[PDB]
Structure 1
Amino acid sequence: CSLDNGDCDQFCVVCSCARGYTLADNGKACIPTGPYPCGKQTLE
């Protein structure tokens, strides 16, 4: 995890994500489950 956060989009190799997100196929990116996921600025 020390370098590059283990190439993880959120938590770190074993990547993981915050509530309202699922770990992607690639096992690194995090996919938002709803339209207003935590921690994302909102767009119209």
Structure 2
Amino acid sequence: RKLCSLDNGDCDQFCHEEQNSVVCSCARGYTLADNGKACIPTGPYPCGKQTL
């Protein structure tokens, strides 16, 4: 296991391999964090989160 197959490339959501390295990205309503791995909700009620 390497790149995306190693714990999802440390990405919160989507992981793709471009050239020989990890590129992370997020679903609509999320912005990729400064670290290029975490996905930050852009506002209230982001998709896919339980409303607990």
Give the TM-score taking structure 2 as reference length: 0.79
Higher helix proportion: 2
Consecutive unaligned residues in structure 1, runs of 5 or more: none
Give the TM-score taking structure 1 as reference length: 0.92
Give the structure with higher Rg (CA).
Answer: 2
Q: CA RMSD in A?
A: 0.7
For 1:42, what is the secondary structure of its paired residue? Answer: coil
Consecutive unaligned residues in structure 2, runs of 5 or more: 16-21
Q: Which runs of 4+ in 1 moved over 6 A?
A: none
* Identical aligned residues as a percent: 100
